Design an enzyme around this catalytic site. Structure first.
Site, PDB file in Angstrom:
ATOM      1  N   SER A 105       0.831  -1.191   0.000  1.00  0.00           N
ATOM      2  CA  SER A 105       0.000   0.000   0.000  1.00  0.00           C
ATOM      3  C   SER A 105       0.880   1.262   0.000  1.00  0.00           C
ATOM      4  CB  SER A 105      -0.937  -0.050   1.212  1.00  0.00           C
ATOM      5  OG  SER A 105      -1.891   0.987   1.173  1.00  0.00           O
ATOM      6  N   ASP A 187      -8.783  -4.104  -6.875  1.00  0.00           N
ATOM      7  CA  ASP A 187      -8.403  -3.391  -5.655  1.00  0.00           C
ATOM      8  C   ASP A 187      -9.534  -2.440  -5.252  1.00  0.00           C
ATOM      9  OD1 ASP A 187      -7.188  -1.546  -3.736  1.00  0.00           O
ATOM     10  OD2 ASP A 187      -5.247  -2.285  -4.395  1.00  0.00           O
ATOM     11  N   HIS A 224      -7.268  -5.267  -1.949  1.00  0.00           N
ATOM     12  CA  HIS A 224      -6.094  -4.510  -1.536  1.00  0.00           C
ATOM     13  C   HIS A 224      -5.194  -5.308  -0.637  1.00  0.00           C
ATOM     14  CE1 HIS A 224      -3.827  -0.836  -1.253  1.00  0.00           C
ATOM     15  NE2 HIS A 224      -3.954  -0.762   0.076  1.00  0.00           N
TER      16      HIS A 224
END
Length: 317
Positions: A105, A187, A224
């Site tokens: 991330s 995502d 994600h």
């Protein structure tokens, strides 16, 4: 691309050092370190305890991580100071040997920010393995105007931000060290990621850009967190870490590796924890810093985002 001396750190060395921990070792004396950079709303352990900490250990590394306070919600530029300091420490502590950096991330944005603006670490990082990196930020919370009070780093990860603008103009959307980016069209946090092209937030020019669905097909779905934790992600990550080129190799992964569930080598308990990776971020934000403006760019970054709006006003020449 910025050259010459590193910009000064805004944080004291003691503060930066306090943010770095290695498994069963001190940074000053560590065998085969890997530096793990966590995601928004997490510490290093929260991002990696269920996944890359044990997985990198089984691959022969000593996992190390930074936990910039509070939970990666503060200014991304400050979070980067922790990473740059950590690379300097771990390079020295492993006998002046380059080390890999593995991220999730925001961690990838931090890594690329560091490599763009702190030239000293370019000779100390042998590869970057970034899972779901948001180099372009994300469009999913809407435009900057109209964002509600948000954490400093949440501002900076919003597409259109001064930070993401500066990174792009400074040359940061091209790989600096050998880089692999593993990401997903599905995502739910970072978009756009659908095109399998330079439009994607996770894409770097000259990088090994691996959109999962390009290999696995339209029915492959990872989110994600799944981008970090999946068995597919493990095979790609293992390939990148072992590669003599510093990037994952297409020969090392294919359709037979397209398992969206947590990495096989994780214990059943670790798989459950990995699935629930996003959970701690929710508490973190509620008790976390919030403001109505994007943090000011550091002086070193300002010439690459003139005209963008931050807390003090419009970035001037």
């Amino acid at each position: 691309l910025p050259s010459g001396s590193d910009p000064a750190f805004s944080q004291p060395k003691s503060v930066l050092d306090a943010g770095l921990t290695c498994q069963g070792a001190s940074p000053s004396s560590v065998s085969k370190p890997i530096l793990l950079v966590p995601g928004t709303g997490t510490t290093g352990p929260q991002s990696f305890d269920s996944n890359w900490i044990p997985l990198s250990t089984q691959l022969g590394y000593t996992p190390c991580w930074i936990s910039p306070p509070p939970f990666m919600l503060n200014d991304t530029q400050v979070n980067t100071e922790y990473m740059v300091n950590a690379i300097t420490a771990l390079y020295a502590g492993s006998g002046n040997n380059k080390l890999p950096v593995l991220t999730w991330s925001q961690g990838g944005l931090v890594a690329q920010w560091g490599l763009t603006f702190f030239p000293s670490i370019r000779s100390k990082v042998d590869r970057l393995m970034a899972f779901a990196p948001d180099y372009k930020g994300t469009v999913l919370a809407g435009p900057l105007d109209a964002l509600a009070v948000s954490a400093p780093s949440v501002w900076q990860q919003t597409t259109g931000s001064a930070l993401t603008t500066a990174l792009r103009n400074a040359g940061g959307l091209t790989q600096i060290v050998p880089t692999t980016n593993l990401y997903s069209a599905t995502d739910e946090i970072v978009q756009p990621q659908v095109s399998n092209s330079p439009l994607d937030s996770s894409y770097l020019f000259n990088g090994k850009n691996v959109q999962a669905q390009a290999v696995c097909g339209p029915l492959f779905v990872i989110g994600h967190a799944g981008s970090l934790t999946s068995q597919f992600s493990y095979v790609v990550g293992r390939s990148a870490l072992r590669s003599t080129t510093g990037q994952a190799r297409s020969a090392d992964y294919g359709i037979t590796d397209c398992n969206p569930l947590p990495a096989n080598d994780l214990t059943p308990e670790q798989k459950v924890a990995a699935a629930a990776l996003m959970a701690p971020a929710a508490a973190a934000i509620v008790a976390g810093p919030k403001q109505n403006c994007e943090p000011d760019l550091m002086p070193y970054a300002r010439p690459f985002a003139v005209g963008k709006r931050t807390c003090s006003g419009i970035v001037t020449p």
